[PDB]
Amino acid sequence: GASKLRAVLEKLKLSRDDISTAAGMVKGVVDHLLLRLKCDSAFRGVGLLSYYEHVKISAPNEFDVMFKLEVPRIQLEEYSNTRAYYFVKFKRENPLSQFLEGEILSASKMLSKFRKIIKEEIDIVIMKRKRGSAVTLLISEISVDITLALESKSSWPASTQEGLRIQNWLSAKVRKQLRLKPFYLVPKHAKGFQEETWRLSFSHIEKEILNNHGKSKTCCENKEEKCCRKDCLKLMKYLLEQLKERFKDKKHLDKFSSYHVKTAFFHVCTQNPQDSQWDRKDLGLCFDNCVTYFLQCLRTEKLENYFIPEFNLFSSNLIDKRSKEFLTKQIEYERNNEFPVFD
Amino acid sequence: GASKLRAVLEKLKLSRDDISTAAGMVKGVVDHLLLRLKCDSAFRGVGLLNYYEHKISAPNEFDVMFKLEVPRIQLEEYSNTRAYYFVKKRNPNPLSQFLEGEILSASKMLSKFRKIIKEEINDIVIMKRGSAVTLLISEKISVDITLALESKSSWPASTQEGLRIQNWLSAKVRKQLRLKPFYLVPKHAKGFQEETWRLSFSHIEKEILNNHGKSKTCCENKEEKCCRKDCLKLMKYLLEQLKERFKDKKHLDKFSSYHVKTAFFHVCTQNPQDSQWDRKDLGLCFDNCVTYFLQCLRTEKLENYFIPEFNLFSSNLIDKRSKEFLTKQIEYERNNEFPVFD
Ligand SMILES: COc1ccc2c(C)c(CCC(=O)N(CC(=O)O)CC(=O)O)c(=O)oc2c1
Numbered sequence: 001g002a003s004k005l006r007a008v009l010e011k012l013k014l015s016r017d018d019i020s021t022a023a024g025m026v027k028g029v030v031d032h033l034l035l036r037l038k039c040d041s042a043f044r045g046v047g048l049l050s051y052y053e054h055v056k057i058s059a060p061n062e063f064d065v066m067f068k069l070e071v072p073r074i075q076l077e078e079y080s081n082t083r084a085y086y087f088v089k090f091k092r093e094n095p096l097s098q099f100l101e102g103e104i105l106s107a108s109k110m111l112s113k114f115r116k117i118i119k120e121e122i123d124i125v126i127m128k129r130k131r132g133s134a135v136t137l138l139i140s141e142i143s144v145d146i147t148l149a150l151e152s153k154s155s156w157p158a159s160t161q162e163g164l165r166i167q168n169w170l171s172a173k174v175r176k177q178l179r180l181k182p183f184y185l186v187p188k189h190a191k192g193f194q195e196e197t198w199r200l201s202f203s204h205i206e207k208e209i210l211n212n213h214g215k216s217k218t219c220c221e222n223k224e225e226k227c228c229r230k231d232c233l234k235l236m237k238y239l240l241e242q243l244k245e246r247f248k249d250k251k252h253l254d255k256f257s258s259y260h261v262k263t264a265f266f267h268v269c270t271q272n273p274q275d276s277q278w279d280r281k282d283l284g285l286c287f288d289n290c291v292t293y294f295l296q297c298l299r300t301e302k303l304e305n306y307f308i309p310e311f312n313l314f315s316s317n318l319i320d321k322r323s324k325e326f327l328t329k330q331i332e333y334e335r336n337n338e339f340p341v342f343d
Numbered sequence: 344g345a346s347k348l349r350a351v352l353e354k355l356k357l358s359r360d361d362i363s364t365a366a367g368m369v370k371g372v373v374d375h376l377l378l379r380l381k382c383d384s385a386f387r388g389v390g391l392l393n394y395y396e397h398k399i400s401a402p403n404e405f406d407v408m409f410k411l412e413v414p415r416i417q418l419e420e421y422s423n424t425r426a427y428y429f430v431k432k433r434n435p436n437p438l439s440q441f442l443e444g445e446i447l448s449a450s451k452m453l454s455k456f457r458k459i460i461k462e463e464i465n466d467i468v469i470m471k472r473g474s475a476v477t478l479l480i481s482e483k484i485s486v487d488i489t490l491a492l493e494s495k496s497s498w499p500a501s502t503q504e505g506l507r508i509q510n511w512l513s514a515k516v517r518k519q520l521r522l523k524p525f526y527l528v529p530k531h532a533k534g535f536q537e538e539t540w541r542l543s544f545s546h547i548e549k550e551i552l553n554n555h556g557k558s559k560t561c562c563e564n565k566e567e568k569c570c571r572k573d574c575l576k577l578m579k580y581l582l583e584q585l586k587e588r589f590k591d592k593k594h595l596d597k598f599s600s601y602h603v604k605t606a607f608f609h610v611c612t613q614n615p616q617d618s619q620w621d622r623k624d625l626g627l628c629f630d631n632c633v634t635y636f637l638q639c640l641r642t643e644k645l646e647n648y649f650i651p652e653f654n655l656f657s658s659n660l661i662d663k664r665s666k667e668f669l670t671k672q673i674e675y676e677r678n679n680e681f682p683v684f685d
């Protein structure tokens with residue numbers, strides 16, 4: 001019954017076309033903000049990490065952008081064996097020294113000035129406060145979440161050593177090339193709460209793996225090699241967002257995000273490395289297997305971060321068992337009934 | 344005689360295994376040359392491009408390229424040659440001491456390049472008598488050093504229809520590769536014009552050869568072993584053994600591994616599927632590579648892989664008699680199970 005799936009994919013592509021003008025508005029504001037920010041000595045190396053992303057596939061007018069800032073000769077200290085959260089210290093003048101709180105970089109000090117500079121130039125289209133990762137701009141009745149990210153061109157942290165298990169899918173050579181790219185750190189407090197910590201971010205790798213996703217270099221570049229990998233992820237994200245909207249009056253689904261669906265999907269890509277396992281003619285079965293994998297993650301309360309295998313996104317310290325059970329029931333309901341939430 | 348081909352590949356592997364000491368020696372010398380060159384104001388941004396590459400049958404003979412970025416470069420094509428350019432946007436520019444009117448003199452630049460290298464090796468190596476220096480390290484290792492300008496601007500218009508890898512390595516990869524810099528190496532053209540620079544894509548040729556499959560996991564497991572690289576090795580070895588057997592007739596001095604490599608890349612474009620290169624078929628794959636090279640020689644057509652309007656086999660570059668001689672020798676070798684491999 002993939003035809004209803006194809007209908008959803010049809011209407012998602014229409015809303016993407018109808019938004020292209022809004023993306024141009026975001027580019028104009030973002031470039032303007034960036035020009036101002038590079039005049040400040042603390043944010044001289046600021047730059048864009050495309051130019052935008054859509055955390056919510058069903059909200060085409062809500063944009064997400066990342067501003068990166070390179071931190072040379074960074075030294076990381078893992079917070080409380082969390083594998084993903086770190087204090088930032090410097091090895092050796094330092095343009096970020098005004099942000100130190102002792103020997104660690106203060107995320108609170110950095111965000112405070114970041115928020116202030118953006119406030120000064122938004123001389124332009126309002127700006128909204130965040131609930132660390134920093135501000136939400138509203139543009140001409142279009143919202144743009146801006147995240148600040150430190151960039152490190154050093155070897156990835158040791159907690160990633162066993163992650164990104166793409167060797168049998170995208171190749172060991174590609175894994176080597178990707179792990180030579182930088183990694184990013186976004187301000188994120190760790191749970192009272194531990195402030196001044198930063199969380200690893202690999203959004204740039206996730207984008208690369210999704211847009212260059214086949215074992216074949218020519219996957220999806222011709223008729224004989226069209227796969228349905230991207231469409232399966234679109235439909236998984238749309239399923240979660242529709243369930244989150246339908247049950248927004250309950251607390252049960254608040255903690256689930258497109259990141260969980262995306263992580264599960266990357267694991268499915270690892271389990272199913274051959275392009276022939278993703279023939280676009282099998283979209284119905286491919287999507288069902290994606291849903292099924294996500295459900296197994298929910299039931300077992302195991303969803304390893306794709307880059308940091310010891311970090312369990314579905315730990316009961318993060319999402320209570322009752323919420324996963326609720327999501328499990330609702331997805332199983334949808335699947336048994338040809339996804340009424342897609343109507 | 345496919346087993347004879349594997350015997351050659353075996354012998355070549357042992358040769359390169361017994362050189363990694365010599366390769367480490369050139370890195371030492373190359374590292375010292377770069378440090379001093381960087382002390383010069385005109386070569387401040389110099390660095391390695393590759394570290395050292397090889398003549399497949401001469402494992403103690405190394406080739407290295409020193410790159411130097413030239414920001415806001417302006418190129419003027421020389422006499423419609425598609426590959427050769429005068430280098431000319433800004434105003435006297437760390438290289439202004441090398442200008443001659445508005446053009447960068449390759450002659451001047453190469454003269455300082457050699458002089459700095461010559462004074463440095465005297466501080467430790469013999470320089471042999473434009474693309475630039477040959478060093479003799481001890482009396483065993485040769486290192487050919489080429490200077491290249493680097494430009495991070497979009498590639499010249501003469502490359503627009505080149506690099507036709509879309510059906511093999513993908514259009515996505517071609518776009519990624521064409522976002523990389525391009526290089527210019529001092530090389531005289533045509534008498535001769537002495538201030539021209541020739542486009543170089545050595546870094547792309549390396550990328551394509553080492554990441555060579557339609558499958559990203561080509562050669563990464565038993566099921567996907569292909570013979571692309573071994574075919575290129577055997578093509579180069581065949582030309583080198585012929586060039587050495589007939590060195591004193593000089594009829595083959597004009598042919599180089601670059602012609603072989605260019606024909607090989609065209610064969611890859613013609614045969615884009617990894618299943619066409621199954622290591623089990625090495626004998627037939629090599630024969631087909633040889634046959635393609637022979638067809639290029641007979642038709643006097645071997646387009647540059649990056650610059651399609653540049654014919655490497657034009658009679659302006661290689662006379663008909665020389666191609667006919669090489670054709671005769673290769674056909675003889677192929678008919679007799681390649682005695683020159685012995
Ligand atoms: C690369 O290493 C990591 C390690 C961990 C993460 C995590 C935890 C998330 C967020 C998951 C999520 O939806 N949230 C709430 C929850 O945890 O249920 C909101 C939030 O905490 O922001 C993420 O987006 O990326 C991560 C990347």
Ligand SMILES: [Zn+2]
Pocket residue numbers: 213214219220225226227228229
């Ligand atoms: Zn695909």
Ligand SMILES: [Zn+2]
Pocket residue numbers: 555556561562567568569570571
């Ligand atoms: Zn291969």
